[model samples]
Target chain A: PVWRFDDRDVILYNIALGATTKQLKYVYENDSDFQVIPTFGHLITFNSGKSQNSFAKLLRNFNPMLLLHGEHYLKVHSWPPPTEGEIKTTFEPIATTPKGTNVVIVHGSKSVDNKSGELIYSNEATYFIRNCQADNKVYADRPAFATNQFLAPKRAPDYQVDVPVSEDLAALYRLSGDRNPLQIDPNFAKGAKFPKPILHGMCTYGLSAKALIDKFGMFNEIKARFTGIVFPGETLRVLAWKESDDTIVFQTHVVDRGTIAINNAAIKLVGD
Target chain B: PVWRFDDRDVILYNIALGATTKQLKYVYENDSDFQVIPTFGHLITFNSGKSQNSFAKLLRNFNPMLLLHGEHYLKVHSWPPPTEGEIKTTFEPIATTPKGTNVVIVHGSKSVDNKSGELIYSNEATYFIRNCQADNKVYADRPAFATNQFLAPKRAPDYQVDVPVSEDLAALYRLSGDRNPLQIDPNFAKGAKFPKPILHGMCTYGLSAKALIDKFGMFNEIKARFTGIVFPGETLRVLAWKESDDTIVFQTHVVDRGTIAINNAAIKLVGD
Candidate 1:
């Protein structure tokens, strides 16, 4: 299956990730430097809703509520498709691995330029399902994927900036179509053993990308793991270290909670 | 025309104004003291879109883009309607006054319990339309709406708190339904003479309401003048002075810009 999107879709995707009024270059079509955020390729799936249902069928009635997004990896071969034309995307199930009570399912997607038929970007996402068992017969060498073991410098961060997560961060992000009640419905969160609804993992993902973009210049690649839940309204301090001019490693901490919500983030910076 | 909304709508409204997860009383329905933010009443207008279009029609081809929210005045006859039922609202044109090139239009709305038909709240909003002239025949005294000639106390604020505004504040608020491009479209804002798109006045309006609620319990009324533009990403210091046990006056200033974004705010604390 193929998904198609145009400039309006790209702008809407940017808005969903918290693009601001000042981010005219990404959110406005008429801006001179208008371009889609490179990370937006993560959403260019052919049939996320349909595929999730298929996965549930394959799992033999596994409860969807137990599913959590564990990791996301995106690589931009070229920048995201321009705002001018339609983009086509295809999704395929890449692999599955079992880690104790959790089963990690890996899915891969590729977005292409509809006009030129050129691959724009590729994304890989890992979903961790608790209380789910994978077939023991399947070979599990923990699938060959990029692993990030971020090590902070002994000294203070080379660059640091505080980012405010609005209280409505989850509610607003849900409008982008990820409507897991765990992020907006308080009662639903309580049922899931959370104190309250939590921010969406992808929201944190986008924020981390924005933090890197703000600290350094634009980047061609971003990889991170959602290590913890972030309550909206707590300011997040994004600390980055220049591993090299073209590479940076970063982590985001919820300042009030003093917890690292995002860990092992590595970015590849674009050339000057 | 009538407008209808439920608890989810109320929560979304709260989050748009900066409700945090810690404020479970307002954001979570299962909290023992769960209640909707009183200012959520401000959005209960019937067909705001059609009404604004009608106002443009009356002005004989006035461009709606020139319109700006000038002041917000809300009075609660009782606490917000319970989180369970649908709320019905009706809007009426109160008056229009000429103020040089700007025509100040006053619109009023009432929200009632759809089931009991009980009036729950009333709101009055003032819009300032730039480069437009109202009929000179109308009274020129600038309608005697509540005037906020706020003067800061001689001493420092009795209570103050710093609130961080995320860079994506406007983009997030727009999802809550205030889609004025002036808050998200930079090119449109440049055409309108803003350095960049500005945060929605209503976002500031909600934040001010939240500040008062947090510092001095719940309130029965709210009044404020939107005096300046707030660029997303600036921290705002909400300063308050207790006028009396029952009354409080406050203002919010952009810390980085050193300008008051909201002024002459008066809140009537609910009696114990």
Candidate 2:
């Protein structure tokens, strides 16, 4: 299916990712040099238009609370994203893996320029479903796939920045089209066994992407594995190591909690 | 015209007014004790639905920048605003007064319970148009209507609280349906001769309302006049002098600039 979006949608998505007035290029509509954040493509690839229906169908019987976003990978075939245009998208169920009593469903989506039919971006989302057992049979054993890992460098990080996540971060982000109450309703979070309302995984994802984009300008690809939950009002410290001129490995740590929230993250840059 | 709003809109409106997670009663969707802030009716009375068209028609040839919100008055006929319901609204141009080089437009809007046909709230908005002479003739004199004034007591305020306004306030508040770039776009503000982007007038109004609500609970009526511009990041000191058991007069001053941002403010409570 095709999703129609415009500059207004792009600006709203940027604000949803916590872009402040300081980030004029992303959030200011009248900015002569207005630009879209590359991570914004994730919205188009994952949540825009009819693609949500496809995603919902994939998680029919699973309790949404039990489903956790595990991994996110996006490759941008186009350079600067279109501020206003339609994106032709295709959702494909890639594969399902069994880990202990859990199941991991891998889904991939490709977005193309609706007008020119040119490839815009492609994304792969991995959802971990807890306690997956059907027909009195549990697939506990699983073949080993490529293990995703983030090994800390022996020395200090090449680039490190602490970004404070506002207490209203999730509240504002929810307006950008993601209306999951798990991020806003404390009672809902308690019902789901969380201490309080948690920040959306994509919010943290965008934060990590923001760090990389600020340090290395634009990038062609980004890959990250969600390893922990991020609570609002926590400062996120994005520590990056320059692995190469075009590749950077990074991890986001909850500064106060001293826990890594995002791991095995890598961004492939455009050029020097 | 009638308009429909839901709990989601209520929550978003709350967040736009800088309500944090701690204010769960106003920001949460499933608190079981969830409630809407009474001042949220301002959003419904002024900005929600197609009221912008009426406002635009009122400012035919004049640039919107030349117009400023002068006074705001709302009477809550119903207590504890509905979190999800329809508001039947009627907009009327009550009167217009010529004040020297400016024209004061008195517009009134009444919002009713769409289901019960009960009056929910009614608002009176006064807009001051700068340098308002349609023809070569200058009409500088005008008769005064009932003068609305707040006379402070010779003694100190009964209650005063200083609240710091975030720098990103307008950026977040704009998401609550007000997309005027003058509040968020620096360039736009510079074009309008402002040193920088100024905070939304409604933001200050909401802040003052929050103070009164916290101090003396919900009120039946709220009236305020915008007297000065508020720069983001400044602390707002809400000074209240209890005039009587039912009436409380207040004013908001910028602590840094020591200028009154909101003046002639008063709140009328239900009872002692």
Q: Per-prediction RMSD in angstroms?
A: 7.3, 4.8
DockQ of predictions, in order shown: 0.22, 0.47
Specify the CAPRI tier of model 2: acceptable
**Which stretches in model 1 have alpha-carbon errors above 4 Å?**
A1-21, A27-54, A57-101, A106-125, A136-272, B1-16, B26-36, B44-47, B60-66, B76-78, B81-89, B111-121, B136-168, B181-199, B227-265, B270-272
TM-score of chain A of each: 0.86, 0.87
Q: lDDT of model 1 at residue A27?
A: 66
Residue lDDT tens for model 1, B1-272? 34555555566667767776667666655567777778776765433346534444445436667778888888888664466565566666666778877788767677777778888877777778888776544322332324565566778889998888888777655545565778777667887788877887878878877877877888888788888889888888899999888878889899998998988777888887
lDDT of 1 at A40: 66
- Which residue runs does candidate 2 get wrong by more than 4 Å? A1-13, A16-18, A44-61, A77-79, A82-90, A111-121, A134-156, A186-193, A270-272, B1-4, B44-61, B85-90, B112-119, B134-147, B270-272
Calculate model 1's interface RMSD in Å. 4.5
> What lDDT does the true structure give each of the candidates?
0.71, 0.75
lDDT tens digits, residue span A107-224, model 1: 6666777678888777777777877866533322332324666666778889998888877667656544566778877778787678887888878888778777866878777778
Model 1 chain B: lowest-lDDT 10 consecutive positions = B136-145
